[PDB]
Amino acid sequence: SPSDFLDKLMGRTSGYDARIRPNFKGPPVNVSCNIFINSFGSIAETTMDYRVNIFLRQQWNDPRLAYNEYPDDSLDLDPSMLDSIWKPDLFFANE
Amino acid sequence: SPSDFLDKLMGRTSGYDARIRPNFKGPPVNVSCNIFINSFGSIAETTMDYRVNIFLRQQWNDPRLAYNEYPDDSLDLDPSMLDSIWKPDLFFANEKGAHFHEITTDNKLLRISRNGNVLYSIRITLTLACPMDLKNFPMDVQTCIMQLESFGYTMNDLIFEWQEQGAVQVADGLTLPQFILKEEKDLRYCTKHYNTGKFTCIEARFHLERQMGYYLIQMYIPSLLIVILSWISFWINMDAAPARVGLGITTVLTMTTQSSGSRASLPKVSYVKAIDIWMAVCLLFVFSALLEYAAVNFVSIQRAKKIDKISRIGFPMAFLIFNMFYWIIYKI
Amino acid sequence: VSCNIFINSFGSIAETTMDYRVNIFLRQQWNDPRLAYNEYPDDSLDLDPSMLDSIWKPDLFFANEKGAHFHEITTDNKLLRISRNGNVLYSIRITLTLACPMDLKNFPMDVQTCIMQLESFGYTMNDLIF
Amino acid sequence: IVILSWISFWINMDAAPARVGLGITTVLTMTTQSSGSRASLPKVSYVKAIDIWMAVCLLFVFSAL
Amino acid sequence: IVILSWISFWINMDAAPARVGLGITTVLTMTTQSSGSRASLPKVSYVKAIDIWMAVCLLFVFSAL
Amino acid sequence: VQLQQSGAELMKPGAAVKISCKATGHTISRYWIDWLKQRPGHGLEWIGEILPGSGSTNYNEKFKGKATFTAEKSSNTAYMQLSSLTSEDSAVYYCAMGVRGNYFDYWGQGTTLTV
Amino acid sequence: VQLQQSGAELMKPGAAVKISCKATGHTISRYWIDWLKQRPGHGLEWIGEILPGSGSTNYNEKFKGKATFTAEKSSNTAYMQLSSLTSEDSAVYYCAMGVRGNYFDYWGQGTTLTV
Amino acid sequence: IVMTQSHKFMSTSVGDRVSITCKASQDVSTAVAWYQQKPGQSPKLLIYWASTRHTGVPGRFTGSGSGTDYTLTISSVQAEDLSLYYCQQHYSTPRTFGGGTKL
Amino acid sequence: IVMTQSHKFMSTSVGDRVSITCKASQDVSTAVAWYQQKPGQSPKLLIYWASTRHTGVPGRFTGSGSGTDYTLTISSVQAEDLSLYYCQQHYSTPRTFGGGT
Ligand SMILES: *[C@@H]1O[C@H](CO)[C@@H](O)[C@H](O)[C@H]1NC(C)=O
Ligand SMILES: *[C@@H]1O[C@H](CO)[C@@H](O)[C@H](O)[C@H]1NC(C)=O
Ligand SMILES: *[C@@H]1O[C@H](CO)[C@@H](O)[C@H](O)[C@H]1NC(C)=O
């Protein structure tokens, strides 16, 4: 079941924790990532800034999420369950 | 029971999931949708945007919501239970800042039909930024747009469409300063392809026929009045050597005061406009007045009357040659 | 819904922005007849000003509101009074920036009927009347 | 400034560099009055009653020289 | 306005109240140009290239009288 | 504020005709316009609905594919076009406008059509 | 809006050649570009994909290390470079552009290559 | 959605009590409308939502009824009252009218 | 993921009912397309998402089928209506076509 798919991924029966980085007690996580700019510009003279609109692609490996139930390779998910999984802590210096 | 009605719809005993698109493991979802504008307008020059208030109707099918309990066809629901059901992930490309409206209630309509079709409506205030071509700014037709776009789903999951009949609605009485909203509206298919993949897009085309009623009296009339004010330089006595010098220099400063009093809300854009070259050619004509007389001052008797004979009659006939030339080209 | 407004700071009419920032209270009354009680004999009875999200509420908004918000200063500024039979007195505080389309043919001698428009959204006219 | 334009029509006729210093500065002053009249004012297409008083006062000081 | 200062050096030598009305107004105009050049500009310590062009154009119209 | 109609017509069976409804007072795309069928002997019978800004309709179950609802924003005029006239269709029609609900309070004047 | 290709070529086994795809109408980095292999006797066979702004690809499992995808933004031209030509590789190629999904609706004209 | 009245005609005299017993299919709402059509002119609203009245209404006509029964009660009959009557449900998408009753 | 047709040639009389069955490997979706290729020129879209049409195809070309069966149905055959026929699946990453007709 697609409901039972996320039951093995996340939730109670899964035992997943989102508070732990992937590859714990071992290697770090390298992040291949790039930006998808939308409205770059509005460079200010006095305020000395510019308002930019971007998308932020990033990729990593979370190797504790193996599955053999559904044979789909690429698989989108719910865009609100991302707080139930691990996330990088990136920010911008002069944001 | 009406409490037991939602118990079979949503909640514990239902087994509904809101995290799954309708028609899963199969067809995508086409979305017939249109906007209900409320306060379109406030087009900014420097900021290059406009603050619009819309309602957003959209319709789709969620076929796992069949019921035979209550025989009502159209049935409104609680406007706060919409987070407990599936929702499209639309946003706007140039939205530049947007938010909901939780004033006294989530202003979020949710109507479910008998079979599973869902009528949906929410209220969104935008500040959409349009890249505006301003080669002829007082006579421009600016197609300022919005772009609906799905983000968390590709084109094998969700499709945006318009309505087959009446795919845009304009609330009446929406009259604007410097603008009229043109009635015919192009509704075409944009499409976004990202590195994640194929994304569905739909967009509207709002042609802004600008009303030039502001810049005529405010800008054109002070540009018109000072040019013909330069003509009385060429009629006074020739012994008015400290008097004629007090006319052209102050009025070219006045046109400089006109030029400095013409770019306040104007943006800082590279290419030239049509509004500024009228200011510059009116600046050049009032610039043209005294070096005529400075060419007289090297000559200065009837020989100086000959070079004024070109200027006393021929030069006040030398202004309408450009005014007719102006309105022909950049009127489209 | 019998209702009226209790204005506090009307004014700040803007010329360019074409709006005005008003501070109001919003009284409204209706009947919720499934709230009958014979336990306590008090007729008028105030309640907790934060339990209003646990009961039904009208879905009113303003048409040209142009930006609005609640006031949670030290308490949800949200009155809730329930009568004996089931009639509900209700009052909340809303700051608006209502935009009026102003006819300015004679601007120093104008009489500008600047308006607000209450409106229900999540219910049709077979469910709610203002 | 409109009644200030009336003293142009009373001075000596040999005041040819003097009368020229009155009307041009005051029509610049009414232009300074007109530019000092539209700060908080919106940008609306149709004409008002406040601006045509400025324009007819601009035309009367324009009428002097 | 810089090439506008050149017509000071061509008029009659008996134009003593006339030549004085050219350079002082135009250096005020370049001051009006300089004051009409720093609106959105920040307040930074070091010198630019945009402002020294304004200053050398201010000095050339200063150089006339 | 009251609506207005044009002159009544007369057609043959199997034909098709449009019924106009001129609006005086406001912009007709703001409010709804409904239609009622008054066949004599029997009574009144609602047809449908049109918001003239949208043209979105809800035709009746007995009147599926019966009427065609268009609008004229250039002169504030609502249009109802029929098709396949039979002897069951000789009736009196009305363009009404009911504001505070599905009932009817504003009207035109009535148009009688005979097949 | 239709794509365009250059003249067809002819090579020897074991060689390598690039196939160009000139774009007329827009900027080709906006949309995808796909490639299809039409060997006669058999049918069509998709190769890969390229967003010309990124160059991000998804080559086929049978075509792992088969094609090389580059782009020319100076004249809106997409490039497909091959390697290690064999007798299984004499085919007809296409630069297509399928907008509303993984299928194909816009095309060029076709280029036949023989090993 | 089937409406059911009682009679097309009821014989009475001027200044009497007369009521109309309309009945709907199921319990739609209290959304009950009453239309009076004089001969030669249009049908005019009398009562909407089974209790309220029009602007410029005849004030001597009352409405009542709830559930599966609804009634246009007329306790005062005058000379201009000789006309037709209709009931209505408007709590659904079809606007199904009643049987009709001329006085 | 292999699209599997039934025949390599389908010729009949003019104006017949012809149905082209093409089975996929697994139940991918109703993402089923149909491609017609005239000789001497390029292929062309017929159906996408198993029910719709390309812009400019007047009538007589419909699609149906779901699950493990999908069908291109042509009830009105004309003179130009015999050429290369192909099924398609586009609910996965490998864009794999069918047998061909
Ligand atoms: C990240 O680390 C993995 C671990 O070996 C490596 O294979 C990969 O090339 C690295 N770089 C990426 C994903 O850009
Ligand atoms: C959406 O898809 C369904 C599925 O067949 C179709 O019937 C409908 O016409 C489509 N378009 C809409 C709802 O605008
Ligand atoms: C609201 O409806 C009730 C129901 O009969 C009525 O008694 C009352 O007068 C109405 N108006 C109000 C409360 O203003």
Query: Chains A, I: CB contacts under 8 A, how many?
Result: 3
Whether the Cβ atoms of residue H6 and residue H88 lie closer than 8 Å to each other:
no
Phi, psi of B160 (to 5 degrees): -95, 140
Please report, for residues A83, F103, G108, the alpha-carbon distance to residue C125 in angstroms, rounded to integers and kept in the order given. 40, 11, 57
3-state SS record for chain I: CCCECCCCCCCCCCCCCEEEECECCCCCCCCEEEEEECCCCCEEEEECCCCCCCCCCCCCCEEECCCCCCEEEECCCCCCCCCEEEEEECCCCCCCECCCC
Positive or negative torsion for Cα C103, C107, C111, C112: positive
What is residue B217's three-state secondary structure?
helix
CA distance B149 to B204: 12
Task: Give the whole-angstrom CA distance, residue F69 versus residue F86.
Answer: 20
Sheet bearing G18-23, strands edge to edge:
G3-5, G18-23, G77-81, G68-72
Distance CA F97, CA F95 (A): 7
As beta bridge partners, residue C4 has C27
CA distance B232 to B223: 16
Q: What is the token pair recorded at A36?
A: 């998808």
Pairing of strands H18-22, G68-72: unpaired
Tokens of F34: 């409904």
Cα–Cα dist F1/F26, whole Å: 8
User: Which one of E2, E6, E7, E61 would you mutate to disrupt binding with B, by most B Cβ within 10 Å of its Cβ?
Assistant: E7
CA atoms within 13 A on the CB side of A17: 6
Distance CA B275, CA B282 (A): 11
Looking at residue G105, what DSSP letter applies? Answer: -
E22 touches chain B (CB under 8 A): yes
CB-defined contacts B:G, below 8 A: 22
Tell me the β-bridge partners of B191.
B200
Closest ligand 2 atom, residue B159 Cα: 1
Cα separation, H18 vs H82, whole angstroms: 12
Q: Do B28 and I91 touch (CB under 8 A)?
A: no
Report the candidate in B121, B11, B16, B133 with the shortest Cα–Cα distance to residue B66: B16
What single-letter DSSP state applies at residue B87? -
Chain H and chain F touch, per 3+ beta carbon pairs within 8 A:
yes
Place of tokens 């193996």: A66
CA separation (Å) from B229 to B219, B220, D13? Answer: 16, 14, 22
Gap between the terminal Cα atoms of chain G: 32
A91 touches B at CB < 8 Å: no
Nearest-angstrom CA–CA distance, A14 and A36: 34
Q: Which residues contact A87 (CB under 8 A, 6 or more apart)?
A: A18
Q: Which residue of I has its CA nearest to B27?
A: I30
Alpha helix ranges (H) inside chain B = 2-9, 213-215, 221-229, 245-260, 275-287, 290-299, 302-309, 320-329
- Which residues are CB-contacts of A58 (< 8 A; sequence separation ≥ 6)? A31, A32, A33, A88, A90
I93 contacts A71? CB cut-off 8 A: no
Looking up tokens 């106009």 gives F20
Instruction: Return the C-alpha torsion angle G96, G102, G103, G105, nearest 10.
Output: -50
Contacts of B71 (CB under 8 A, 6+ apart): none
Residue contact B241–E29, C-beta within 8 A? no
Please give the Cα distance from B60 to C65 (Å, whole number).
Answer: 30
Distances, alpha carbon E20 to alpha carbons B242, B258, B298, E13, E62, in Å: 9, 24, 18, 12, 12
Cross-sheet strand order for the sheet of G33-38: G46-50, G33-38, G91-96, G111-113
CA distance H47 to H63: 7
DSSP 8-state class, residue H63: E
Count the helices and strands in chain H (H runs, E runs).
Answer: 0, 8
Breaks in chain F after residues, C-to-N cutoff 2.5 Å: none
Phi and psi at residue A59, in whole multiples of 5°?
-135, 145
Question: Within 10 Å of residue C24's Cβ, how many Cβ atoms?
Answer: 20
Per residue, the 3-state secondary structure of B98-140, as one string, reads CECCCCCCCCEEEEECCCCEEEEEEEEEECCCCCCCCCCHHHC
Tokens linked to H89: 């449900």
What residues in B contact C65, CB-CB < 8 Å? 101, 103
Measuring CA to CA, how many Å separate C95 from each of B108, C8, C56? 21, 9, 22
| DSSP 3-state of B97 | coil
For D63, how many CA atoms within 13 A lie in the half-sphere containing its CB?
13
Distance of alpha carbon B287 from alpha carbon B281, whole angstroms: 9
Residues of B in contact with F59 (CB under 8 A): none
Alpha-carbon distance values, B48 to B97, B268, F115, G41 (Å): 13, 11, 60, 58
CB H5 within 8 A of CB H98: yes
Q: Would you tell me how many other CB atoms lie within 10 Å of the CB of residue G25?
A: 11
Phi, psi at D11, each rounded to 5°: -80, 170
Please report which helix (H) or strand (E) contains residue A34, including its range: strand A32-39
- Left if phi > 0, otherwise alpha if psi is -120 to 50, otherwise beta: which for G22? beta
In three-state secondary structure terms, B243 is: coil
Q: Which chain B residues are Cβ-neighbours of F55 within 8 angstroms?
A: 165-166
Q: What type of residue is B248?
A: G
Contacts of E36 (CB under 8 A, 6+ apart): B260
- The count of C-alpha atoms lying within 13 angstroms of the C-alpha of A66, restricted to the half-sphere facing its C-beta, is 2
Give dist(CA D45, CA G102) in Å, integer. 50
In chain C, breaks (C-N over 2.5 A) are found after none
Q: What is each CA distance from B179 to B182, C107, D7, G46, in whole angstroms?
A: 9, 20, 45, 51
Measured between beta carbons, the chain E residues lying within 8 angstroms of A49 are none
Distance A30 CA to ligand 1 centre (A): 7
At residue A81, φ and ψ (nearest 5 deg) are -85, 10
Experimental method of this PDB entry = cryo-EM
State residue E3 phi and psi, 5-degree precision: -75, -20
Rounded CA-CA distance B3/C31 in Å is: 20
Of C100, C63, C70, nearest to B103 by C-alpha is C70
Can you say whether the dihedral through the CA atoms of B270, B273, B275, B280 is positive or negative?
A: positive
- State how beta strands G46-50 and H101-102 pair: unpaired
By C-alpha distance, which of H61, H55, H49 is closest to H88?
H49
Whole-angstrom distance, CA of residue H42 vs CA of residue H61: 19
Q: What is the 3-state secondary structure (H, E, C) of G10-57?
A: CCCCCCCCEEEEEECCCCCCCCCEEEEEECECECCCEEEEECCCCCCC
Paired with B142 in beta bridges are B208
| Beta-bridge partners for A89 | none
| Chain E neighbors (3+ CB pairs < 8 Å) | A, B
Q: Name the residue among B170, B60, B38 with its Cα closest to residue B110.
A: B60
Task: Provide the Cα torsion H3, H4, H10, H16; round to 10°.
Answer: -70
For residue C125, what are the contacts with CB-CB under 8 A and spacing of at least 6? F100, F101
In single-letter form, the type of residue at position C72 comes to E
Which of B213, B217, B164, B161 is CA-nearest to residue B190?
B161
Helix, strand or coil, per DSSP, at residue F23: strand
CB of B163 closer than 6 A to ligand 2?
no
- Pairwise CA distance, residues B106 & B100, whole Å: 8
- Tell me the three state secondary structure of residue B156: coil
Instruction: State the Cα angle at H54 between H48 and H57, rounded to 5°.
Output: 125
**CA C8-C12-C16 angle, 5° bins:** 150
Question: B24: annotated binding-site residue?
Answer: no
Calpha distance C30→C129 (Å, rounded): 10
- The sign one gets for the Cα dihedral B64, B67, B72, B77 is negative
For residue A24, give every residue at least 6 positions away whose Cβ sits within 8 Å of its Cβ, in sequence order, or none: none
Residue with structure tokens 């009354």?
Answer: C29
Residue B132 contacts residue B144 (beta carbons within 8 Å)? yes
d(CA F84, CA I59): 26
User: Which ligand 2 atom minimizes the distance to the CA of B161?
Assistant: 14
Instruction: Look at residues B127, B126, B122 and name the one whose alpha carbon lies nearest to residue B102.
Output: B122
Q: What is the dihedral of CA F68, F72, F73, F76, to 10 degrees?
A: -110
Please count the other Cβ atoms lying within 10 Å of the Cβ belonging to residue A49. Answer: 12
| Amino acid at residue number H17 | R
- Does E45 reach chain A within 8 Å, measured CB to CB? no
For I50, name the nearest residue in chain B, comparing CA atoms only.
B27
Contact G94, I37 (CB under 8 A): no
- Work out the number of other CB atoms within 10 angstroms of the CB of residue F61: 8
Resolution (A): 4.1
| Interface residue D10 vs chain C (CB under 8 A) | no
D29 vs D17: CA distance, rounded Å = 19
- Report whether C94 contacts B48 (CB < 8 A): no
Pocket lined around ligand 1, Cβ cut-off 6 Å: A 30, 32
In the Cβ-directed half-sphere of H1, how many Cα atoms lie within 13 Å? 19
The answer to whether B198 is a known ligand-binding residue is: yes
DSSP state of F55: -
Structure tokens at F84: 């396949």
CB atoms closer than 10 angstroms to residue A20: 11
| Residue E29, amino acid | T
The b/e string for E19-32 (b: 16+ C-beta within 10 A; e otherwise) is bebbbebbbebbeb
SS3 sequence of chain C:
CEEEEEEEECCCECCCCCCECEEEEEEEEEECCCCCCCCCCCCCEECCCCHHHHCCCCCEEECCCCCCECCCCCCCCEEEEECCCCEEEEEEEEEECCCCCCCCCCHHHCCCCCCCCEEECCCCCCCCCC
Closest CA to A39 of B91, B141, B39, G52: B91
What's the N-to-C CA distance of chain C in angstroms? Answer: 5
Q: What span, in angstroms and rounded, lies between the C-alpha atoms of C60 and B176? A: 26
For A59, the token pair is 């990729």
Contacts of B242 (CB under 8 A, 6+ apart): D17, E15, E17, E18, E21
Cβ of B23 closer than 6 Å to ligand 2, yes or no, is no
Q: Give the span between the Cα atoms of B108 and B81, in whole angstroms.
A: 9
The DSSP letter of residue B325 is H
Q: Do chains B and I touch (3 or more CB pairs under 8 A)?
A: yes
Residue to mutate (ligand 2; options B29, B30, B34, B165; most atoms within 8 A of CB): B30
